[PDB]
Amino acid sequence: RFKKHVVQHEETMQAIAQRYYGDVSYWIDLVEHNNLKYPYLVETDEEKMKDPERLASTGDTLIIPIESDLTDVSAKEINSRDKDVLVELALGRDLNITADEKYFNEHGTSDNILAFSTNGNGDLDTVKGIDNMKQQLQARLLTPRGSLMLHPNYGSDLHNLFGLNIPEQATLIEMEVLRTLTSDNRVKSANLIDWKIQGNVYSGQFSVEIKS
């Protein structure tokens, strides 16, 4: 895992390692992760134009490992070249099945609702990054608790919670949604920020803390 950062005006590479990891001494290993040539951070972009991929300048992103992966040579090699592909790999890659986004939001808690799609040309669509995490939360919420053919106790009792719209039913629904969202270890916490009623319609929203 890693933290994101950006190059500030005339910040030296010594200064970053000292602020995040404490000891300045660690900058030496920290430059290999960002694959930098000797002018590790340089102010001017027309100087980055010298050989763009092997440098960082003012306004560019940087990668900051956690201290345990700082010394790992494999983490060094991977972070050297992958660069922005970090987030995608770290959140993982999967087949996209939100083909009919307008449609699956008309019949949730019913089956047969999702389907493969095609993007690009001649290849099934795929999803990655934060979109993948959303899609997976979405599918997990719209699936009943014991309906996947292996590893059951997956999904929700959202199909079971339909009731007289009195507030206790609404707190129950809130708690089920929060449990469902907090099931995945990748997510830190969820919390409600609004619940709202319109006769026979529930509405509400939840904030979820995704790890960096």
Partner: protein, 48 residues
């Protein structure tokens, strides 16, 4: 309370030898026979 009201002004009586004739007015207790209702259902909000 056997009568609701009566106009005290409206008592007229005439006597003629052995014979008398009387007239008066009484407000009887009024009933309450019909009730109509207009019952409406509305949306409502409840919130966090």
């Amino acid at each position: 309370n056997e009568i609701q009201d009566f106009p005290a002004e409206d008592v007229q009586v005439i006597v003629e030898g052995n014979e008398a004739r009387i007239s008066m007015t009484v407000y009887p207790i009024r009933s309450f026979k019909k009730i109509s209702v207009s019952l409406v259902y509305k949306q409502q909000t409840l919130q966090a």
